[PDB]
């Protein structure tokens, strides 16, 4: 791979060439994004985008000198994050000499949890919509890497309540679970097609507790949802789920 990229901070765009089309053509997929940990040694490491792209194998690649990349938060947010990657030399072959395609990647753009990202890229010079575009929702606190981030841990991402829930009567469910050192207040909820029962629990000890939920419908096979009320997450803490079972479970 002879040509390389030196990437820099030029703005030079407009959050309008990214929304040139309301619908972006669905086959502009030469552009991929994946999240990568900035530091391996760290659990609460910052998360960056690894934006990689492949170049078209055709004669116009000889006219290519820069690729522009803009990332947009889309949440009634605007762009203002563009980078311009200049290619250091001209492209002599339409592919690498032992390379599926010409491939480049840029790592940057710090990522927030549970965030929708539109990323568009355009080759310089050359149509005048995005040459490549991808939609991207960053992972949340349930992802295997993001769960160790501080905001996720403090919201209960690593809480293992080990819910056991049993259909006791025609209208009651017994829910057992192990409390967390992160909080003392919990709400147990039983849900089939709608919420059929709720119970609140106050327990200050780290213990395996038990609570009866009175239900209004069929509970066998319904979901149990445990909401903890840990600090920093208010009413938006990570919920834990289980399923209601017939007890006794043996013959």
């Amino acid at each position: 791979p002879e040509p390389t990229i030196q990437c820099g901070s030029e703005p030079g765009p407009s959050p309008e060439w990214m929304v040139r089309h309301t619908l972006t053509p669905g086959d502009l997929r030469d552009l991929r994004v994946e999240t990568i940990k900035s530091n391996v040694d760290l659990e609460d490491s910052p998360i960056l985008m690894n934006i990689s792209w492949i170049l078209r194998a055709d004669a116009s690649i000889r006219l290519l000198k820069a690729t522009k990349i803009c990332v947009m938060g889309k949440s009634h947010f605007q762009s203002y994050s563009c980078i311009r990657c200049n290619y250091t030399q001209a492209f002599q072959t339409q592919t690498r000499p032992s390379g599926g395609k010409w491939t480049f990647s840029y790592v940057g753009f710090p990522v927030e949890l549970n965030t929708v990202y539109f990323i568009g890229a355009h080759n310089i010079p050359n149509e005048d919509g995005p040459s490549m575009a991808v939609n991207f929702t960053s992972p949340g606190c349930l992802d295997h890497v993001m769960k160790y981030k501080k905001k996720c841990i403090e919201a209960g991402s690593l809480w293992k309540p080990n819910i056991t829930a049993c259909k006791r009567s025609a209208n009651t469910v017994e829910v057992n679970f192990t409390t967390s050192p992160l909080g003392d207040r919990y709400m147990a909820l039983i849900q089939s097609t709608a919420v059929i029962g709720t119970s609140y629990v106050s327990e200050k000890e780290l213990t395996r507790t038990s609570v009866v939920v009175h239900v209004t419908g069929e509970s066998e096979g319904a979901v149990v949802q445990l909401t903890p009320y840990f600090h920093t997450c208010g009413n938006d803490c990570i919920r834990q789920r289980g399923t209601v079972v017939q007890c006794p479970q043996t013959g």
Partner: antibody
Amino acid sequence: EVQLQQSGPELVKPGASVKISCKTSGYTFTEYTIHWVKQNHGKSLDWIGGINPNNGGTTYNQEFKGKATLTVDKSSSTAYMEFRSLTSEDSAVYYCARSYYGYVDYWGQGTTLTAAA
Amino acid sequence: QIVLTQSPAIMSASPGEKVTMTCSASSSIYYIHWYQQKSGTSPKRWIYDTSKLASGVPARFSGSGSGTSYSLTISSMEAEDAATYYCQQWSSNPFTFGSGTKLEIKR
């Protein structure tokens, strides 16, 4: 399983307006673009436009622009296509279809629109 | 802006013979997709992303191509294969189809 259920055939006065519907089920409605496609008696397929049901954003084939309007109703998981003034040139079967990337993986069954005096 | 030209418009193939139909794009596209339509029903996704077969599509079918040139191939014609095949692109707006190859069975 994914299903796109389209409304039934329509007889429409020439010059009058008509609105046909596309009822989706079996998937998260707001996650997939809905396209509309015309097929005339010559059997060629014409894309009319698509709509993002998440935000209602649309893109139209400019060969049809101003004649058709696409809307969704998220609560019922339904897409709509409205022709403001159907003419004899507009009599055809109309499909809705769901897209993933650049292709459509599910099609409605089609709705015949006939301009008849 | 891109348009798709399909050839041949109509063809008939002997049972057992190899069938090829082509799709030519007015400028380069990232993928082509193919739909099958039999008279009186909706088109069905047949080959997508240029060379992947939808579930249930016979492995006698294959697609290939790149740039502006693509084709759909049947290794050995079967009577069930007779239908109209449309190619399709959405590398540029508007989303467009080719005009179709109507494939009939010789007897």
